[PDB]
Design a binder for this molecule. Structure first.
Ligand SMILES: N[C@@H](Cn1cc([N+](=O)[O-])c(=O)[nH]c1=O)C(=O)O
Ligand SMILES: N[C@@H](Cn1cc([N+](=O)[O-])c(=O)[nH]c1=O)C(=O)O
Ligand SMILES: [Zn+2]
Ligand SMILES: [Zn+2]
Ligand SMILES: [Zn+2]
Ligand SMILES: [Zn+2]
Lengths: 258, 258
């Protein structure tokens, strides 16, 4: 049985290769998670096909219907056997799917156009000249929605009602919005992405302040899947072998252009 | 049934209260892990008894007898129901006990007496004037014994054969050795401990360089135990509701003496 892997186009985790049009199957893709997938499959001994999540979302549960979308939904409804992606380990997800131990740590962070007069989340919350938002479906939005911290709740109150909307469908759209907004939009996004983007041309963005939280990405499987245990053990093995660090260095800093 | 919790006297995770001789049961202890245990218990809905691990050890498998010592052994042999302590999530332990998702991130780091001419593991590995060692049992030592990375193996090769022994029995012993050795002993230890000590009088130590690796502490339960699921969910809930961050700040920095 070939294992169906659900993933998402998000640099430098999974990207189309320069010459992908002349390539087929898994070979079209490169990135940290593409490499992680190959290692996991090697150590657990399976063959697999990478497939990009149809709706291009990470996964949230619809309030009215209670149906899960995104990569999470593909696992929940049996469309994929495993998700190998920058997928945040969260409580609401852990209730419907299984996560391995984390293969990467991260936090929510702030991205600004260079020269923007912002140093912190508190700075953002105390002003109005500069708009700010998050990836409009995923763990970061849910963080602000659920936050009982005054600074973040204040920010959520602003974001939920902002007009026009401050939420974006993809990271690419968020970043483009910072780049074109002349310093009038700051983007809240995961630190790993922020750090990658800061080192790529045109080198006009930067991460400011510390992370707003601490969490991790894990490999996800359907609850009670037989893949859950071997995969978890494979992640810890790769961590202890230094492989996760090697991949991180390969995809972030060896790819710096600034 | 009252849940038996195994833990270890290691500041500031668990410490004897000043008037402990006058107190009983759980009230004898204080620290990050005592606070965490209270929250875990409250969220899972169980009564518990804190007990200090008899042999004062974290957990290793004796190569000869194959017997597990430390907190891991107390779980494997059924002497405790759960371990709430700075216990590192590792592959070999995951094979015999269950771990929650990590409640704290960390890495192996270098502690020096202020003014020691050392900035990194490479620096340490390329010289012999300054001695260096690790806790004589635990995941840090195992990290070096197992590492296939040139620098860390070079360090291990030095450390296993160094005489007198560069290894120490307790964190306290390592720190005292740093402080007394006039810059001629550096101590390799987990970053969280390093960070704690840097804010303690006499304020004569510091963490230098990046971390050598990345990993996490997890709450541990016997394989197959029914506490595993609720406990994991409780960890994620505490992470997301900011409790883990509050606790780290309370015990590391709010008490800061430097
Ligand atoms: N990892 C998240 C998805 N996700 C991704 C990014 N991102 O890649 O910058 C983000 O800023 N916010 C977010 O919730 C999840 O799993 O929902
Ligand atoms: N957390 C470890 C134990 N452990 C603790 C410390 N520490 O408290 O400084 C250390 O420096 N090295 C180590 O292996 C494990 O679980 O074995
Ligand atoms: Zn194309
Ligand atoms: Zn491998
Ligand atoms: Zn005493
Ligand atoms: Zn609570």
């Amino acid at each position: 049985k070939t294992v169906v892997v659900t993933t998402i186009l998000e640099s430098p985790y999974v990207m189309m290769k320069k010459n992908h049009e002349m390539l087929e199957g898994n070979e079209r893709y490169e990135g940290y998670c593409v490499d992680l997938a190959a290692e996991i499959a090697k150590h657990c001994g399976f063959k697999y096909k990478l497939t990009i999540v149809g709706d291009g979302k990470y996964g949230a549960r619809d309030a009215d219907t209670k149906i899960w979308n995104g990569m999470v939904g593909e696992l929940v409804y049996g469309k994929a056997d495993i998700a190998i992606a920058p997928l945040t380990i969260t409580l609401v997800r852990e209730e419907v799917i299984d996560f391995s131990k984390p293969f990467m740590s991260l936090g929510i962070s702030i991205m600004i156009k260079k020269g923007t007069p912002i140093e912190s989340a508190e700075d953002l919350s105390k002003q109005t000249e500069i708009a700010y938002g998050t990836l409009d479906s995923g763990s970061t939005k849910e963080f602000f929605r659920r936050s009982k911290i005054a600074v973040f709740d204040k920010m959520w109150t602003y974001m939920r009602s902002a007009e026009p909307s401050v939420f974006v469908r993809t990271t690419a759209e968020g970043v483009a919005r910072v780049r074109k907004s002349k310093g009038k939009y700051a983007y809240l996004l995961e630190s790993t992405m922020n750090e990658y983007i800061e080192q790529r041309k045109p080198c006009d963005t930067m991460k400011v302040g510390g992370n707003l939280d601490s969490k991790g990405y894990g490999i996800a499987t359907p609850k009670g899947s037989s893949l859950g245990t071997p995969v978890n053990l494979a992640v810890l093995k790769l961590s202890e072998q230094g492989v996760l660090d090697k991949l991180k260095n390969k995809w972030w800093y060896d790819k710096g252009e600034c």
